[PDB]
Amino acid sequence: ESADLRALAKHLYDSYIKSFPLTKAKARAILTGKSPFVIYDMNSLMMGEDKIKFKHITPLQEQSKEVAIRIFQGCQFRSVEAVQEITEYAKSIPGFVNLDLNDQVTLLKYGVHEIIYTMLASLMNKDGVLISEGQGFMTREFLKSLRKPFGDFMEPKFEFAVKFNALELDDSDLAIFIAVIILSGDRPGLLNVKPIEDIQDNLLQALELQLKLNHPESSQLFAKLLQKMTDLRQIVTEHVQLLQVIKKTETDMSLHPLLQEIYKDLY
């Protein structure tokens, strides 16, 4: 049993690495100074629109407007990327591609943002967030100052990230934590729960052992970590409401078809 949980950890870690090119270690280094373009306002945003060439697409929309919009729209590019990376990594969780396709869709639909905010925290410190695969650093204060409702679309994630990073998880820990989140059996509209819960039981055992080996003096880390899953749901449901108020009060800005699918009929 012990050796198999270990092998399962090792495997997920391996796929976690292939699937997400920029890692916590990689990005923690950059942040501690262990040379990124800094975005602090509009001008330095555009001047950093050649940070990684540009967030293009950059279709022939988003190209455009005031700062909050330009940023809101660049956020969708990166988050389509992320959904693909995540989908990819899910396929690698043993047992997952064996599930009903409808169940597979549901798990990803409901778990994707929880994972996006989990992974984003690796990329943050109290003062700002990395972007463009660590080539840019966007300041927190800039992100708040965004006005209409776009302010505080990111402040809550910073607040969560700062607490989450205090747990000081590494990539090996995060690898299994993310697996566990995807294999959540309480997703609305699951067809049959039993096989998903069987897999999670397994990831949970593996996570528990990982925490004990890797963080031997961190008391009740396993518990503290599952408690973060509630923090995470709040951010997700807060985010969704923001989404709903944009799709009305703000002008008709376009949405990537992939995001529309995930967003429609979810809470």
């Binding site: 959904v83 693909q84 989908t87 597979q104 078809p257 992939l258 699918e261």
Partner: peptide, 12 residues
């Protein structure tokens, strides 16, 4: 599976 982009992502 009226999440068709996603169904494809998962469908190899």
């Amino acid at each position: 599976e009226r999440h068709k982009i996603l169904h494809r992502l998962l469908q190899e």
